[PDB]
Every structure is written in C-alpha cells, then in structure tokens.
Amino acid sequence: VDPDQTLKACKALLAHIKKAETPIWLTLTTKKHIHDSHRLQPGKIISVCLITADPQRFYKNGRVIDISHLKAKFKAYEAQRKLFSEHDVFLADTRIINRLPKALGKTFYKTTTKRPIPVVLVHLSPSTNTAIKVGYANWEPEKLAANIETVIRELVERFVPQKWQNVRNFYVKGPETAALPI
Amino acid sequence: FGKKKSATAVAHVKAGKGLIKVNGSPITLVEPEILRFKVYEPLLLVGLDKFSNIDIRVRVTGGGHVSQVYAIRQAIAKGLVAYHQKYVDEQSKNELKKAFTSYDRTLLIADSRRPEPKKFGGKGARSRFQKSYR
Amino acid sequence: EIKLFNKWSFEEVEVKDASLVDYVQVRQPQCPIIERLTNSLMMNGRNNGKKLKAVRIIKHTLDIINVLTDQNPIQVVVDAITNTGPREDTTRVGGGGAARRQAVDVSPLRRVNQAIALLTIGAREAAFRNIKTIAETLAEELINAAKGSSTSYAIKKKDELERVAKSNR
RNA sequence: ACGCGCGCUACACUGACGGAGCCAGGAAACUCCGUCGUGCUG
Structure with a gap:
C-alpha cells in the first residue's frame, strides 16, 4: 500500500527466494465486491497473433488464426502449445471471445498469461483475486514498486466507490520464492 | 435441381449474362479441381x-467433395433444358438435351446408387469380419 | 466417372493389331467402353485404395510420357497395352495328380486386362528407378514399354508367360 | 519363462511433414503450396 511497505515486501521477497532469472508476481485479494456485476477487472494497466475473420484478418496479414481453426486447435493441444510459446501477445475479435476461451482458454490462460485482448492484462475473471507480473529479479526494488503502483492505481480508480479499501491482502513473490504478505 | 449419390445441386434459370456462379463463385474456379472440368x-x-x-447459375451443397462436383454437373445442363420456353429453348429443346446427353451421365439423369446397409458381422455391408476358429 | 481430356488429345484411331480394337476402348464380354482404356490405366492405379491423385498420377504420367519422345501420348498408352499383352499361357491340368498345365487364349479383354494391371504392377514396383516419380515408373516402364516396345524392357514377363507356354504344352 | 485367436498401427517418395482449401451422414481420408532426400531419416 504505502511505498515503504511495498519496498519491504519486495526486499523480503528477494531474500526469501532460495534453494534462471525469476520474475516477480504481485497478488491481491479483494473483499466486499460482487464478482457477479461488472466489478470484474480486465484491463491493460499493469510477436503478435491475431485471431479473427475478414477485415481484422486482412489487416493482420502478423500470424493470423482464422475463426475456423479455433475448434481445431482446441482439439490439438500439440499445435496450440507451440503457438502459445511462439507469440508474446494475442489479439482477438471480440465476438470470438466465447469460443476462444472455451477451446483455447485452458492453454492460453493458466499462467502463461496468454489470453487474447479483444478488439472490435489484469484479468480478475469471476474470482476475487488477481495475479500480475510486475518485473524481474534484474530490476531494482524501486522499479518493482513503481510498477506495482501502476497496477494498484487501476483498482483505486475502478471501485472509485471504495478504492484500495477493497484490497483484502497483497503479496509479492518471486517465481520460485514464497509469497510474502505486504 | 439434381442430386448425386448423397449430394444435391440446385438449378437457377432465367436469362441474363456471363459469369455463371456455382455455390457463389465462378465455374472458372470450382477448386476441388483436377477434374475441375466435367463441370466446365x-x-x-x-x-x-x-x-x-x-442465362443463369445456382448453388449446390450435400454429402462431400467429388459428390458435389458430380452434382453441380447435372445441375447445369439439367437446367439449360429447363422446360422451357423461358428456359431450355422456346421450341424443340431436344436441341441440347439429346445432344447434351448423347455423351452424358450427369444431365443423363442420376445414378441409382446410394449409401446404406451393413451387417451383423465385421465391417458390415458384405465384408464380414475375418475369423478362423480352430 | 471421372477423368478429363485435352492435355494432347492425340487420338490415334489405328494402332490395334490382332483383335483388340474390337475392344480397344471397351470391356463387355464385362463392361462397355470404360473410357478408351486410359480410364483403366488411370484406374488400375488405385493400388493404395482411392482414385484421384491417381487421376493426377495418370495425367502427369502422361504429359511426361509423351513430352519424353512423343508418340502422341495416348497412342503410346494404347501402343503400350498394345504390343504388351499375354497370348495363350497355360492353366492347370488335373489330368495327372499332380497336374501339368496346357495353354491357349487369352480372351482378348484378357490380353488387354492381364497386361493392363500388369504394366500397372511393374510400374508400382518402383525399386528401379526407385525415384519419386510414381508416374515415371508408371510412364517409363510404360515408356520402357513404348520405347520398351523395342525390347525389353519393363514388361518382360510379357514374354515369359508366352515364351514358356510352348514347352510345357 | 511360454503357447493359440480377434485386432490396432506401422516398414514409408501414391510418403511423412508444416500452411493452407470444403463438406458428410472446424469428420477424417482427401486437393493445393512448400520442406525433407528412399539413408531403420524427418
């Protein structure tokens, strides 16, 4: 929450990690918000593939994944896994989103935060919490905190009705390391 | 107007110009090609x-590939000769016809073949599984 | 069903020794005229279990098998299964034990057929030239059955069957 | 330890392999374009 407190969080997290450069994840749980309403947050506050049909597909022609292929890919995990590894971001026609999560979501979601961005990020989904990648082991503690702040800013703005008050608990953690509560 | 061995092609008839589109294309294309002729x-x-x-042109769709191809086939000349007189020939439409079927098999009506039937056996149909009890 | 045309359309209406022509584009005695042979050359090609590509096969085998020293392609194909049939082989005996086998015709449609799926075979059995041109083996071998219509050179058993049904006769 | 039977998929160049085309009662076999080089290779 406060800068000093987060700095400690980050510092402690680095020290604890023990046993490749790990990455730092920030996790926050929310309270007293109904996930049913459009309380859910999906936002881009914290190689490209395009999934879509004509127009969108035309502009892309970037790798293009056509509407027809979506079911086929859901069926063959082997190819889908490869596609996910190859590209950093995915953009998808918004209407297509139901189908893509049904078929693709298991591979794309999980951790490899690959879920596509709709076109005519922090993604809560129906669940109360959020996990976001804030930075690397390489970067300074100060930078990690700054990044965390940008993430926090989005929440503050959304439930402007309560703001940060909603955050039940915040934690930081390295890939390998254990989570530490702010 | 003509279906082919589990497939089926529909006929469009009323005088016009060039570019006769099959499905919604152009009997230039028709890309399950190789034998892309026999259509053209x-x-x-x-x-x-x-x-x-x-004149005109209509769309087909049924069963699978070469099926359809063979369907769009009759589809056409089974619709040049279209009655007539607004389609076929306002008189003696045996003009085409008997000619467009003195070497035909598409417009030459359809084939009495059609998938079905198996057997309490192996694969079924007639090929009954391979058993050799001792 | 279900081939094409053009591609040369060199229709040699002669070349048909012995009988044959009275069934050069036939089948009956049991089809009718199962498109002028080349509908069976192309068909005897479905030895994996499905035509088309088979269709290609034929076609390629053709443009190839004519490009290379053209004899009107189709007439190489006719003149392929032409001077390239069996002619009175033997067939069991029963008159013994322990048979022996006597010989004779060769019911035309035979001669055509029994040489058709045959030249077809010799082709299929690549292994020389074990290249990658199915239509080549299919051609050359059929070409080595047009040029080969000058000994031997691919058929062979062609003779054998006949150059044998003489002694044990 | 091993025997007998119904099979499944393979020995591959009509192939395997990636992109792509379509359509049955995003089916697949399949068509095209390209990569592999008949070597227990892919």
Whole structure:
C-alpha cells in the first residue's frame, strides 16, 4: 500500500527466494465486491497473433488464426502449445471471445498469461483475486514498486466507490520464492 | 435441381449474362479441381449446339467433395433444358438435351446408387469380419 | 466417372493389331467402353485404395510420357497395352495328380486386362528407378514399354508367360 | 519363462511433414503450396 511497505515486501521477497532469472508476481485479494456485476477487472494497466475473420484478418496479414481453426486447435493441444510459446501477445475479435476461451482458454490462460485482448492484462475473471507480473529479479526494488503502483492505481480508480479499501491482502513473490504478505 | 449419390445441386434459370456462379463463385474456379472440368464441361459440353447462351447459375451443397462436383454437373445442363420456353429453348429443346446427353451421365439423369446397409458381422455391408476358429 | 481430356488429345484411331480394337476402348464380354482404356490405366492405379491423385498420377504420367519422345501420348498408352499383352499361357491340368498345365487364349479383354494391371504392377514396383516419380515408373516402364516396345524392357514377363507356354504344352 | 485367436498401427517418395482449401451422414481420408532426400531419416 504505502511505498515503504511495498519496498519491504519486495526486499523480503528477494531474500526469501532460495534453494534462471525469476520474475516477480504481485497478488491481491479483494473483499466486499460482487464478482457477479461488472466489478470484474480486465484491463491493460499493469510477436503478435491475431485471431479473427475478414477485415481484422486482412489487416493482420502478423500470424493470423482464422475463426475456423479455433475448434481445431482446441482439439490439438500439440499445435496450440507451440503457438502459445511462439507469440508474446494475442489479439482477438471480440465476438470470438466465447469460443476462444472455451477451446483455447485452458492453454492460453493458466499462467502463461496468454489470453487474447479483444478488439472490435489484469484479468480478475469471476474470482476475487488477481495475479500480475510486475518485473524481474534484474530490476531494482524501486522499479518493482513503481510498477506495482501502476497496477494498484487501476483498482483505486475502478471501485472509485471504495478504492484500495477493497484490497483484502497483497503479496509479492518471486517465481520460485514464497509469497510474502505486504 | 439434381442430386448425386448423397449430394444435391440446385438449378437457377432465367436469362441474363456471363459469369455463371456455382455455390457463389465462378465455374472458372470450382477448386476441388483436377477434374475441375466435367463441370466446365457441361458448359463446354454445350459443344453440340450452343456456345454458352446468356442465362443463369445456382448453388449446390450435400454429402462431400467429388459428390458435389458430380452434382453441380447435372445441375447445369439439367437446367439449360429447363422446360422451357423461358428456359431450355422456346421450341424443340431436344436441341441440347439429346445432344447434351448423347455423351452424358450427369444431365443423363442420376445414378441409382446410394449409401446404406451393413451387417451383423465385421465391417458390415458384405465384408464380414475375418475369423478362423480352430 | 471421372477423368478429363485435352492435355494432347492425340487420338490415334489405328494402332490395334490382332483383335483388340474390337475392344480397344471397351470391356463387355464385362463392361462397355470404360473410357478408351486410359480410364483403366488411370484406374488400375488405385493400388493404395482411392482414385484421384491417381487421376493426377495418370495425367502427369502422361504429359511426361509423351513430352519424353512423343508418340502422341495416348497412342503410346494404347501402343503400350498394345504390343504388351499375354497370348495363350497355360492353366492347370488335373489330368495327372499332380497336374501339368496346357495353354491357349487369352480372351482378348484378357490380353488387354492381364497386361493392363500388369504394366500397372511393374510400374508400382518402383525399386528401379526407385525415384519419386510414381508416374515415371508408371510412364517409363510404360515408356520402357513404348520405347520398351523395342525390347525389353519393363514388361518382360510379357514374354515369359508366352515364351514358356510352348514347352510345357 | 511360454503357447493359440480377434485386432490396432506401422516398414514409408501414391510418403511423412508444416500452411493452407470444403463438406458428410472446424469428420477424417482427401486437393493445393512448400520442406525433407528412399539413408531403420524427418
């Protein structure tokens, strides 16, 4: 929450990690918000593939994944896994989103935060919490905190009705390391 | 108007111009090609009386590939000769016809074949599984 | 069903020794005229279990098998299964034990057929030239059955069957 | 330890392999374009 407190969080997290450069994840749980309403947050506050049909597909022609292929890919995990590894971001026609999560979501979601961005990020989904990648082991503690702040800013703005008050608990953690509560 | 061995092609008839579109395309394409003729060979087949005409074209769809191809086939000349007199020939439409079927099998009506039938056996149909009790 | 045309359309209406022509584009005695042979050359090609590509096969085998020293392609194909049939082989005996086998015709449609799926076979059995041109083996071998119509050179058993049904006769 | 039977998929160049085309009662076999080089290779 406060800068000093987060700095400690980050510092402690680095020290604890023990046993490749790990990455730092920030996790926050929310309270007293109904996930049913459009309380859910999906936002881009914290190689490209395009999934879509004509127009969108035309502009892309970037790798293009056509509407027809979506079911086929859901069926063959082997190819889908490869596609996910190859590209950093995915953009998808918004209407297509139901189908893509049904078929693709298991591979794309999980951790490899690959879920596509709709076109005519922090993604809560129906669940109360959020996990976001804030930075690397390489970067300074100060930078990690700054990044965390940008993430926090989005929440503050959304439930402007309560703001940060909603955050039940915040934690930081390295890939390998254990989570530490702010 | 003509279906082919589990497939089926529909006929469009009312005088117009060039570009006769099959499905929603152009009997230039029709890309399950190789034997992409035998389609452009009904129109070509018009080689017996006419040269192309100046009329219409409709869409097909049923079963699978070569099925459809063979369907769109009759589809065409089974619709040049269309009654007539607004389609076929306002008189003696045996013009084409008997000509567009003195070497035909598509417009030459359809084939009495059609998938079905198996057997309490192996694969079924007739090929009954391979057993050799001792 | 279900081939094409053009591609040369060199229709040699002669070349048909012995009988044959009275069934050069036939089948009956049991089809009718199962498109002028080349509908069976192309068909005897479905030895994996499905035509088309088979169709290609034929076609390629053709443009190839004519490009290379053209004899009107189709007439190489006719003149292929032409001077390239069996002619009175033997067939069991029963008159012994322990048979022996006597010989004779060769019911035309035979001669055509029994040489058709045959030239077809010799082709299929690549292994020389074990290249990658199915239509080549299919051609050359059929070409080595047009040029080969000058000994031997691919058929062979062609003779054998006959150059054998003489002694044990 | 091993025997007998119904099979499944393979020995591959009509192939395997990636992109792509379509359509049955995003089916697959399949068509095209390209990569592999008949070597227990892919």
